[PDB]
Amino acid sequence: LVPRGSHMPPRLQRFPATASADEIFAAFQEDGCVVIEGFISPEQVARFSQEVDPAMEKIPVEVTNNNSNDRTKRFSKCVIASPTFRNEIIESDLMHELCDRVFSKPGEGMGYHFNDNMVIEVQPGAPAQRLHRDQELYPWWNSMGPAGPECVINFFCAVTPFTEENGATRLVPGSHLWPEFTQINERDCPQFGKIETVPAIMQPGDCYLMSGKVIHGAGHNATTTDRRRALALAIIRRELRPMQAFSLSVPMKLAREMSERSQTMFGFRSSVQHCDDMVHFWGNDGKDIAHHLGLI
Amino acid sequence: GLVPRGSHMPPRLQRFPATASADEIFAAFQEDGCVVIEGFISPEQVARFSQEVDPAMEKIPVEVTNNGNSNDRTKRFSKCVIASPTFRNEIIESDLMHELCDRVFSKPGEGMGYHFNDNMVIEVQPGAPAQRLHRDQELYPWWNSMGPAGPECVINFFCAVTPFTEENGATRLVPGSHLWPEFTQINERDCPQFGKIETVPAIMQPGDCYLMSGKVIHGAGHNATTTDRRRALALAIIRRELRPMQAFSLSVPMKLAREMSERSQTMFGFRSHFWGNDGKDIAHHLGLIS
């Protein structure tokens, strides 16, 4: 708390992973983003960081003369690398309940799947990325405005601490409700230069859940020694294409050891949509693709 | 000229030979939302395709349900690559199809902006009820909310494998419905025009197709015949950002994938930055790049 008269920056609500999902969903609806403390346990986060570390050592640091991949290591093969990720982290019931509240329709099953599973290590000195919305990946989505449905949501987990100085993500709460969704540039955004943000200060295992409609951007890692790690669990709706071809690069040995909802998340199993007709997305001539892969 | 002077002029489908300019076909497609391409598939290849899928079509039982869904007295079959050499080696390698797909979907400097949604043999059986009027892009349920200012979602190259007649269940198209100001469900509750919606049959010979926008209202007609099984081949093509209805890269044998050109590998998801592999083309891991 600050002296009376100080300006108050935007509110980023926070809940323990033990709070009711409806009370966390309620804050997600208000602000577009919410911090879930203890989403991952400190021992699970430590084990995951250690389990992906040898792959992360082999990634070189990309340094360039301009970007968002400037001094940032990126690694997406978490299912292959980390048993704690594939056995425990993706199996968070709180994650899946919130995904259902966002994405799933009645009588249709899982309305969502994985877009990506990226580990990020932001090096000391890495610059701050432009303000943007994640749904800009699906370029038509902004044109539907705040009345549009959700494209994507992110559970952005802290693996090491997120501080203001080591570059914690800067969010714009309530930007999912602005009347018009433009790109954030001088030409297109009238608020440009005048958009107040709030960092997502978190401890390891905390995550923020962020709508694809919310304006955000990574902060500058101003430190001397802090290599800030994050795990982005990016989840899209059933009808959108994933940025990783998990079902073609994850081995069937790991597919056979997954639960049915994890197979669905990675495309080892289909989902049934109802269109006036029950339609399989990602199916096989009227059957679940899981039959053919030997998973039923 | 076309209609007797003074009469109401109904909707009509422009027709082009397959040797016409893709620019001339695409102008028609933009004006009306659909266009016939005569001879999209050659007579010899159409015949070889039908014969190659016939055993797959024979092992498909005929439902007689009266439940109003799209499978009542309608056979549907999506394993054309696996079943037909002519399909995978010849029919999908039409330069005109890709030139048209490139004008609908591709942006400069980003490669192919499209891939396959489905490859479906649709054989309407004698007696089949008419299907509901719909837009194909209702499969991506938010798209209608964007209106005619929205971008293109899906297009289908709907090819006649056997003749399409007014009497055997030819599709009834509503040209220009891609420009109506509000895209709603086509039913009594939601559509003010319901019951006063002008359609046209797509009359076609084996090898003809119509290219149709996902924004166009259409529906199969009733097969009033007693023996005419109206066989069609629907090549559905979507933006690269959208999920296919078939998991073609998990069901098509790698043996067939290695015989595809690069562009057909891309159509089926054997080649990729969507659908990638941790920063690299998935075709590397699959062993398809040399």
Numbering used by the authors:
A (entry chain A): -2 to 63, 65 to 274, 276 to 295
B (entry chain B): -3 to 268, 279 to 296
Please give sentences taken from the publication describing this entry:
Next, crystallization of PrhA required replacement of the C-terminal region (Glu295-Val301) with the corresponding AusE residues (Ile295-Ser296-Ser297-Ala298). This C-terminal region plays an important role in intermonomer interactions and PrhA failed to crystallize without this replacement. EDTA-treated PrhA crystallized well under anaerobic conditions, and we succeeded in solving four X-ray crystal structures of PrhA at 2.1–2.3 Å resolution in the apo-form, in complex with Fe(II) (PrhA-Fe), in complex with Fe(II) and αKG (PrhA-Fe/αKG), and in complex with Fe(II), αKG, and the substrate preaustinoid A1 (5) (PrhA-Fe/αKG/5). The loop and hairpin regions are highly disordered in the absence of substrate.
